[PDB]
């Protein structure tokens, strides 16, 4: 069966007190967690898929004046159209060029998908690292 990330649900979270340089840290440790500013706006909103979730998150990035600040026009139009910004040449891994949302717990062992405290902003190189090649 298709895994339960492409199905409708309610977004839950508190979120982390980040700073504007948050996008550089998505290739540290396990990724940078979702900011409190984006999570406040998504507090029990119904979403129809994870992608539909991802659209909103990225857009709250352009509507929050600190979060899209380090971006240039091309990444800034992206984010304000709901799509993931891209990575530096040390982080784009051939096909995988955009920022991805990834999780601290594996889905299959009880990972809460629509819960923002578990969703980490990752570069390609990091998503690939924890999910071991794939």
């Amino acid at each position: 069966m298709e895994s339960k990330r492409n199905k409708p649900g309610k977004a839950t979270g508190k979120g982390k007190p980040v700073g504007d340089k948050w996008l550089d840290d998505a290739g540290k440790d396990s990724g940078a967690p979702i900011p409190d500013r984006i999570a406040d706006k998504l507090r029990d909103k119904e979403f129809k898929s994870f992608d539909d979730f991802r659209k909103a998150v990225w857009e709250e990035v352009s509507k929050d004046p600190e979060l899209s600040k380090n971006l240039n026009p091309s990444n800034k139009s992206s984010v304000s159209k709901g799509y993931s910004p891209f990575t530096p040449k040390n982080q784009q891994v051939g096909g995988r060029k955009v920022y991805e949302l990834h999780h601290d717990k594996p889905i299959s062992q009880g990972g809460e998908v629509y819960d923002m405290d578990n969703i980490r902003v990752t570069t390609p190189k990091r998503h690939i690292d924890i999910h071991r090649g794939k």
Binding site: N72, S74, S77, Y83, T87, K89, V98
Partner: protein, 86 residues
């Protein structure tokens, strides 16, 4: 399909058009623009490719025109085939 073979079949105003499209995200999905930027790189040979557009080097002017007048200089410095006959 209707793909170009390399940069040496764009005249500069067409390549300019492809970057303008890219730099405003003038399309409907993400999964287009990842393939448009991969086309930009493998056609012009330049190693950094995507990251030139997406994370500006301090000293360069980050707009479609300026990115193309960077590609112009790059090609002629290294001694490459250049664009089509403009």
């Amino acid at each position: 399909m209707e793909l170009k073979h390399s940069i040496s079949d764009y005249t500069e105003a067409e390549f300019l058009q492809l970057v303008t499209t890219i730099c405003n995200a003038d399309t409907s999905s993400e999964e287009e623009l990842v393939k448009l930027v991969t086309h930009f790189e493998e056609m012009t040979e330049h190693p950094s490719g995507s990251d030139l557009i997406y994370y500006p080097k301090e000293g360069d002017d980050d707009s479609p025109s300026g990115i193309v007048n960077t590609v112009k200089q790059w090609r002629a410095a290294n001694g490459k085939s250049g664009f089509k006959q403009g």
